[PDB]
């Protein structure tokens, strides 16, 4: 994958290119107001070491941080999200894989049309990477999910269990 991050909007100003995870962009990039993703899928983070607010970017041209729903021009680390050639996830009503479970292999724009709960308390990412969204239609706080176990909502970086939609991490090209 390849991404170029720019200090000013419209692909202007000082910039920095990444082709792998970068845990601390601060020396190389003082702010981020636009990005061009040439390939791969990326998660931008407000704080170093993959912490703070998260934002999913795929291939394309993002002329303003608002296009990735960025709440500010602070981008201080980024992950190259591993490609996968399938997706499967189990979402659970309660912590520790308890209660009702609903399984997905495709995107879901409104979890509540499939599952009566406003919250998911644990999940198992069996195949591929996903972005979990606080709100329906891929809005609100974003949480990158990579293959592995998540016994509690705090394991995906959330401060509560609210979930509204779920998206596979896929490069269309």
Swiss-Prot record:
GO MF, any single term: structural constituent of eye lens
Domain Beta/gamma crystallin 'Greek key': 1-39, 40-82, 87-127, 128-170
Record's keyword terms, sorted: Cataract, Disease variant, Eye lens protein, Repeat, Sensory transduction, Vision
Name recorded for this polypeptide: Gamma-crystallin D
InterPro entries reported in the protein's UniProt record: Beta/Gamma-Crystallin (IPR050252), Beta/gamma_crystallin (IPR001064), G_crystallin-like (IPR011024)
Single GO biological process annotation from the record: lens development in camera-type eye
Quaternary context: Monomer.
SUPFAM superfamilies: gamma-Crystallin-like (SSF49695)
Disease: Cataract 4, multiple types: An opacification of the crystalline lens of the eye that frequently results in visual impairment or blindness. Opacities vary in morphology, are often confined to a portion of the lens, and may be static or progressive. CTRCT4 includes crystalline aculeiform, congenital cerulean and non-nuclear polymorphic cataracts, among others. Crystalline aculeiform cataract is characterized by fiberglass-like or needle-like crystals projecting in different directions, through or close to the axial region of the lens.
Signal sequence annotation: none
Similarity field: Belongs to the beta/gamma-crystallin family.
Role played: Crystallins are the dominant structural components of the vertebrate eye lens.
Chain intervals for the UniProt region annotation (Connecting peptide): 83-86
Species this chain originates from: Homo sapiens (Human)
UniProt-reported outcome of changing residue 14 to C: In CTRCT4; progressive punctate cataract with early onset; causes disulfide-linked oligomers formation with consequent protein aggregation and precipitation
GO cellular component: cytoplasm; nucleus
A Pfam family that the UniProt record links to this protein: Crystall
Impact upon substituting residue 36 to S: In CTRCT4; very low solubility; crystallizes spontaneously
